[PDB]
Symmetry: D2
Subunit: 121 residues, 4 copies
């Protein structure tokens, strides 16, 4: 609430989240454009009693890249903070782990960053 | 199932998780001391239909470090895979974001790696 | 140059680097944040024969945060790629490890992302 | 400093390094079977005046995966600390960036961890 609603990253993904009063994040992450085949469940957690000192609100969530259509055998977690105000943002770093054999585990995890805005690009 | 159970990391943290038929992860994360003040909710997702080629099962979860007793204004995400068989393990890397001001955002996020076993370390 | 030149990140740190014919990076780094004063030595490596397919040029470098003035007992590595163009950029992610006791090792390493251009924000 | 010499990671790689009086790390990194084709230049930095409170020694280094024989168009940086004493260790986290097109940049960077010892695994 501040967090609840629709967010857009800088690469074409959208998600919709509900931030519950108990610290829950629940919603849907859509990897592209608009199609059902590109929508996935997301769940996570956030600090439901953040500071009001100019600090962001810590949070994180997961998407496992399986839906009824597709399965990439991988999951992303985003860890970051919500920054409110007129130009609100969710600033994140993420980890994308694929299921691998033990021989390939060294190359199982990508890292990157995403910034989400409320304003549809 | 494989995933469902009680896991421990190398620093004794206790991760009590249930893997639901839908890809859901739910449970609690706590200290080796086992006190209520050290116990926090988690939620996450896993690949409920992993590959059949020997690969692990991708998964992730989040803990926001607030409970009824304490608030660190912080959240951790773990991204990793479950590896089944002879001795089951969950290998992860994690991101811990604390709320910061914008000027301090460059130092908001720690990274590390945790390995979980069904035995204590 | 290409890579050789004076670059600035989104915080205004100054990265003065020379790319040698032998694949070496050498130069100085001056930070806009943290326990840092004046310049610090850097060294690194870059791909001196990048792909010709439109991909960027992979590179990395290290700064240990000790100079003749101050010592923060820590080191940052930046891993990334140079992207040529009308506004050339070096896009990185970085790891900042501090020397810690073993008890504190779990919190030894910060992660982030820096973007460098030849223009100071 | 305790750093100069040959180090081995968990997975078959060998680190030969000299820690100079100027805070420089210089050497080679071999992925190998043990052969010249598997050997790559490394350079980095370390804290040459670490804390005396029992903390480790911060360091980092880079290898670009090009030698006279091959070129993976990628570079790894290791960020970590040397822990001395009876069973000395270099504990690291690493970032491997490949040169990519901008469309592929989200999948440019792998993350992981390596532990180096004085004796072979
Ligand atoms: O918007 C994002 N931000 C950070 C990471 C990330 O990964 C994806 C993504 C979406 C669909 C499939 C897959 C893969 F790789 F096949 F598993 C990954 C989207 C996205
Ligand atoms: O088992 C772990 N593995 C990775 C990260 C991590 O953080 C904690 C932890 C627990 C309580 C509070 C806090 C803090 F920092 F104040 F936010 C962190 C446990 C744990
Ligand atoms: O420009 C940057 N980009 C990414 C990381 C980073 O760290 C520093 C930095 C500079 C001086 C001291 C320290 C600390 F924390 F005390 F060790 C860190 C600058 C900088
Ligand atoms: O020992 C290690 N520890 C962490 C990372 C890492 O990457 C390599 C490595 C070696 C040769 C080629 C390549 C690639 F992928 F083609 F660029 C990577 C070795 C190594």
């Amino acid at each position: 609430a501040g967090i609840t609603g629709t967010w857009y990253n800088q690469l074409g993904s959208t998600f919709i989240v509900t931030a519950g009063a108990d610290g829950a994040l629940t919603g849907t992450y859509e990897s592209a454009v608009g199609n059902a085949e590109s929508r996935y469940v997301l769940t996570g957690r956030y600090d439901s009693a953040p500071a009001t000192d100019g600090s962001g609100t810590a949070l994180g969530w997961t998407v496992a890249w399986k839906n009824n259509y597709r399965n990439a055998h991988s999951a992303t977690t985003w860890s970051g903070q919500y920054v409110g105000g007129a130009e609100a943002r969710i600033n994140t770093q993420w980890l994308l782990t694929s299921g691998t054999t033990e021989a390939n585990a060294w190359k199982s995890t990508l890292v990157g960053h995403d910034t989400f805005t409320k304003v549809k690009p």
